[PDB]
Amino acid sequence: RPTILRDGMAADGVSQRKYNYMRAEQIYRDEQGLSLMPHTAQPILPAQ
Amino acid sequence: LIVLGGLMDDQAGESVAKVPLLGDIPLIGNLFKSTADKKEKRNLMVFI
Amino acid sequence: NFGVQWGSKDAGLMQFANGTQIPIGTLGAAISAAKPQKGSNPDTNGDLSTLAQLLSGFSGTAVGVVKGDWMALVQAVKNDSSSNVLSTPSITTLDNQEAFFMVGQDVPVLTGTVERKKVGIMLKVTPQINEGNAVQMVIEQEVSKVEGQTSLDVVFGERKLKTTVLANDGELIVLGGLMDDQAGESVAKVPLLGDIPLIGNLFKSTADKKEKRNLMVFI
Amino acid sequence: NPDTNGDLSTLAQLLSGFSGTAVGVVKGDWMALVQAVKNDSSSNVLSTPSITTLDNQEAFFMVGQDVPVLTGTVERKKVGIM
């Protein structure tokens, strides 16, 4: 599947859905915490 | 000063090993699983 | 994993492989070789290092249930895993001046003539500043890692890519990635008495394997 | 003078790679060795690499390994998803 990227709106769309999708999966690795220590921060991506 | 390079490594890890039915007992199930873990974090910078 | 292995000493055996991870024939042979012999004059209790090898790489719950002289060797195990790795190298060049970075090692790689080969997190960029404050980069990244095994020589694991992107002034752009996703199933019945809806479950060695692995490279 | 019970590692090799139900039915001094097995398998693999180039600029990707391949002269050969 090719996908051309025009401007900052296109990389906004694709890079936003990939970046916030993977960050969202790390949030699903944050709520689903470790079995031993709840007081340990998971590696999470930055805000924006 | 100016920052030249760097590396902010950050890892995690989990390796639980249950017994399929009597592993998710909420009280005494804990003494059936070999819950591993590994938290690691390493920063690095080069200034001038 | 799961597995039920019946065995009688005089009436045959029921074993399986690849999903129960321990045959009743090899384990019965090892334990049959494990009970000590007697002398004429001393009796040596030293017949071992066969269970110590057969049970060396093994993580399953293996119980032995005797019922009517039928050693119901039940084997079962379930083990989850979860890795999470975040790495972020950085560099500071000028315009149109290439520069790289490394935190790796130097491993002796033999070619016939041993040659030193570099591994580890490399980031070789050559940025160019385009007008409108857009940045064109020629990025040749690599994440190498020494894996073991060691068949004839040491093996590596590379994750390199050599692309050319055009990002904005401070905005992220995804370069590459890999969203791996697997599955698996290996059931091993006994043909007629395997699909019994009630007690048929203790005849099949139902394996499974679920695996999922994501990967991204941003800038 | 001692009697050794140590004649083995022939059933341990002949029954090493074997997954069948093997019963022994004696009937009129006829050892009816019945063997039967059925095993299904199902794999399902979905992989999706991705890349971001410019126009008319080649680029590749890899998640593989480097395996020592001997030619006579050992040479490093790349594997994995390219």
Method for structure elucidation: cryo-EM
Flag whether residue C78 sits within 8 Å of chain B, measured between CB atoms.
Answer: yes
According to DSSP, the residues that pair with C90 across neighbouring strands are B6
DSSP per position, A1-38: ------SHHHHHHHHHHHHHHHHHHHHHHHHS--SS-S
Distance CA D68, CA C11 (A): 49
Asked if residues C54 and C32 have their Cβ atoms less than 8 Å apart, the reply is: no
Spell out the residues 6+ positions from residue D36 whose beta carbon is closer than 8 angstroms to its own: C190, C191, D20, D21
- The H or E element containing residue D12 is helix D11-14
Tell me D29's DSSP state. S
Q: Are C156 and C200 in contact (CB under 8 A)?
A: no
C187 touches chain D (CB under 8 A): yes
Cα separation, C208 vs C218, in Å, equals 34
Chains in contact with D, counting 3 or more C-beta pairs less than 8 Å apart as contact:
C
List A28's β-bridge partners, or say none: none
CA–CA dist C24, C14 (Å, integer): 8
Are C95 and C129 in contact by the 8 Å Cβ rule? The answer is yes
Task: Kindly list the distances between the CA atom of residue C111 and the CA atoms of C104, C106, C118, D74, in Å, as whole numbers in the listed order.
Answer: 21, 15, 15, 5
Residue C75 sits at φ, ψ, to 5 deg, of -125, 135
- Report which of B6, A19, A2 is spatially closest to residue C216, judged by C-alpha positions: A19
Non-local CB neighbours of D78 within 8 Å, separated by 6+ positions: C158, D62, D64, D65, D66
Tell me, rounded to whole angstroms, the distance of Cα C218 from its chain centroid.
26
For an interface test with C, give the residue of A14, A18, A23 to mutate (most C CBs within 10 A).
A18
* Collapsed DSSP state (helix, strand, coil) of residue B29: helix
> Minimal Cα–Cα distance from C185 to chain A, Å?
26
Structure tokens at C168: 């904005």
Evaluate whether chains B and D are touching (3 or more beta carbon pairs less than 8 Å apart): no
Chain C residues touching residue D51 (CB < 8 angstroms): 161, 163, 175-176
Cross-chain residue pair A43–B12, CB shorter than 8 Å: yes
Phi and psi based region of residue C130 (left: phi greater than 0; alpha: psi -120 to 50; beta: remaining): beta
**For B3, nearest residue in chain C (alpha carbons):** C92
- A16 Cβ under 8 Å from any chain B Cβ: no
How far apart CA A18 and CA A37 sit, in angstroms, is 29
How many cross-chain Cβ pairs, A to B, lie less than 8 Å apart? 15
> Measuring CA to CA, how many Å separate C76 from each of C22, C24, C62, C182, C208?
10, 14, 7, 22, 11
Say whether C178 and D50 touch across the interface (CB within 8 A): yes
**Chain C stretch 13-42, residues whose beta carbon is closer than 8 A to a beta carbon of chain D:** 13-18, 23, 25-26, 29-30, 32-33, 35, 37-40
Determine which of B2, B7, B48 to mutate to test the interface with C (most C C-beta atoms within 10 Å): B7
**B12–A42: do the CB atoms touch at under 8 Å?**
yes
Structure token pair of residue B11: 């890892």
Reduced to 3 states (helix: H, G, I; strand: E, B; else coil), residue D65 is: strand
Q: Report whether C99 contacts C139 (CB < 8 A).
A: no
Q: Which amino acid is at C48?
A: L
Asked if residues A15 and A2 have their Cβ atoms less than 8 Å apart, the reply is: no
Decide if C90 and B9 are in contact by the 8 Å CB cutoff: no
Q: Which two tokens stand for residue D41?
A: 């398998």
B37–A42 CB contact, under 8 Å: no
First-to-last CA distance in chain C?
Answer: 41
DSSP chain C: -EEEE-B-SSS-EE---SSS-S-HHHHHHHHHTTSPP-----------SSHHHHTTS---EEEEEESSS-EEEEEE-EEEEE---B--EE----TT--B------EEEEE---EEEEE-S-EEEB--EEETTTEEEEEEEEE--EEE---SSS-EEE---EEEEEEE-SS---EEEEEEEEE--EEEEE-SSTT--TTTGGGG---EE--EEEEEEEE-
Phi, psi (deg, nearest 5) at residue A19: -70, -50
Q: Is C120 left (phi over 0), alpha (psi -120 to 50) or beta?
A: left
Chain C residues inside the 8 Å CB shell of A26: 84
Chain A residue nearest residue B9, CA to CA: A43
Nearest to C174 among A8, A15, A25 (CB): A15
Q: Which helix (H) or strand (E) holds D63?
A: none
DSSP state of D11: H
Using CB atoms, list chains with 3+ pairs below 8 Å to chain C.
A, B, D
Tell me which H or E stretch contains B14: strand B14-18
Burial of D23 (0-12, 13-18, 19+ CB in 10 A): middle
Q: Is A20 on the interface with C (CB under 8 A)?
A: no
* Half-sphere exposure (Cβ direction) of B36: Cα atoms closer than 13 Å: 12
User: Of all helices (H) and strands (E), which one includes residue D13?
Assistant: helix D11-14
Query: DSSP character for D46?
Result: B
Minimal CA separation from D31 to chain C, in Å: 10
Question: Distance between CA atoms of C14 and C7, rounded to whole angstroms?
Answer: 6
Angle at C199 between CA C197 and CA C203, to 5 degrees: 105
- Best mutation site among A5, A12, A15 for testing chain C: the one with the most C CBs within 10 Å? A15
